[PDB]
Structure 1
Amino acid sequence: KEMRILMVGLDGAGKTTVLYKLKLGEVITTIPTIGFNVETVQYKNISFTVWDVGGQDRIRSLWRHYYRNTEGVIFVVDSNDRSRIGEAREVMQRMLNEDELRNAAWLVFANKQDLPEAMSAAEITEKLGLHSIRNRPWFIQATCATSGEGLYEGLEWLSNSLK
């Protein structure tokens, strides 16, 4: 009936694009997210309330204001960006150790799969150290926010962890 979500990731990942592909159905032009966007999207008789936030180094320290009462998390990672996959691992291993996100479900959108140099979801699952997760449910999906592929299959998995 209701669910709260927090979309996060590094800069350039695709968070805003994913959100406004789910909410509107169209690919909008984007500006860097200094503040935050919040939007409700309905699916399977469930109303997800997604909070997209900034990924710039200066806003990554303000994500803590949103950890509270968060039932799911969506970590978006740019697959073409193979040089910052270590920074994302640092961020995610730091945010998995926070106690406010202790029960949160973990979903990972490996975005930008339409690009030729994109890296597979298994290569990302290995590079991010996702099998090391033990206190938490987790899942990884390959997406293309510009085409909508894999986006409605993530909200479908998040439904498993309802209530």
Structure 2
Amino acid sequence: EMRILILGLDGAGKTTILYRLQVGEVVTTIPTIGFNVETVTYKNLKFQVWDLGGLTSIRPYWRCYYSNTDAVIYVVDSCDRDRIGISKSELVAMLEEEELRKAILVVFANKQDMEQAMTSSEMANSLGLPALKDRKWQIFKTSATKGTGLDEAMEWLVETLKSRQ
């Protein structure tokens, strides 16, 4: 059983993803204050996946949960052109935490289905992903609503975790 944090700004689609992953469907959500924790099985691997709220005021607490984290699913709204700089700077901050030194990063460029979506390449550049030191990471175009791209991202994460010292 492996530990995953689903992180990202409020409204990104984190919760939608969690339950899309667990029960294979889209459900109606509220802003997660506190946290949701559910156990997800994919391609026969067991994950304890934790969804935490992204609200401005509840972001400082993310770090309290970084302990023994195997992977971060970092969900970014591809249509939110306004706060992608915040997504960048908050991602920069979290990857500096010693707890996460060993952690695998997967970026969900979410809401890809939408007309106003930034390109996968544009987002990667925006987040300074190529500027990442010692990170095994990949970016994925996704739609939690439509089910687009999730299995592709999960296949990547699963194979990547199957890489042991």
Structure 2 residue aligned with 1:84? 83
Structure 1 residue aligned with 2:62? 63
Structure 2 residue aligned with 1:112? 111
How far apart, CA to CA, are the structure 1 residues paired with 2:35 and 2:151? 22
Residue 21 (structure 2) pairs with residue 22 (structure 1): yes
Q: Report percent identity of matched pairs.
A: 58
Displacement of 1:44: 2.0
How far apart, CA to CA, are the structure 2 residues paired with 1:17 and 1:56? 16
Q: Is the 8 A contact 2:63 2:94 kept in 1?
A: no
Residue 37 (structure 2) pairs with residue 72 (structure 1): no
Q: Is the 8 A contact 2:9 2:55 kept in 1?
A: yes
Q: How does 1:9-48 map to 2 (within 5 A)?
A: 9-48=8-47
Structure 1 residue aligned with 2:100? 101
Structure 2 residue aligned with 1:149? 148
Structure 2 residue aligned with 1:121? 120
In the alignment, structure 1 segments of 5+ residues that lack a partner are none
Q: Please report the TM-score for the alignment, with normalisation by the length of structure 2.
A: 0.95
How far apart, CA to CA, are the structure 2 residues paired with 1:154 and 1:39? 19
Q: Deviations over 1:14-38 (max 9, x none)?
A: 0000011111122111111001011
Q: Give the structure with the higher percent helix.
A: 2
Amino acid at match of 2:98: D
User: RMSD of the TM alignment (CA)?
Assistant: 1.0
Q: Deviations over 1:93-150 (max 9, x none)?
A: 0001010101100000000111101011000011110000121101000000001111
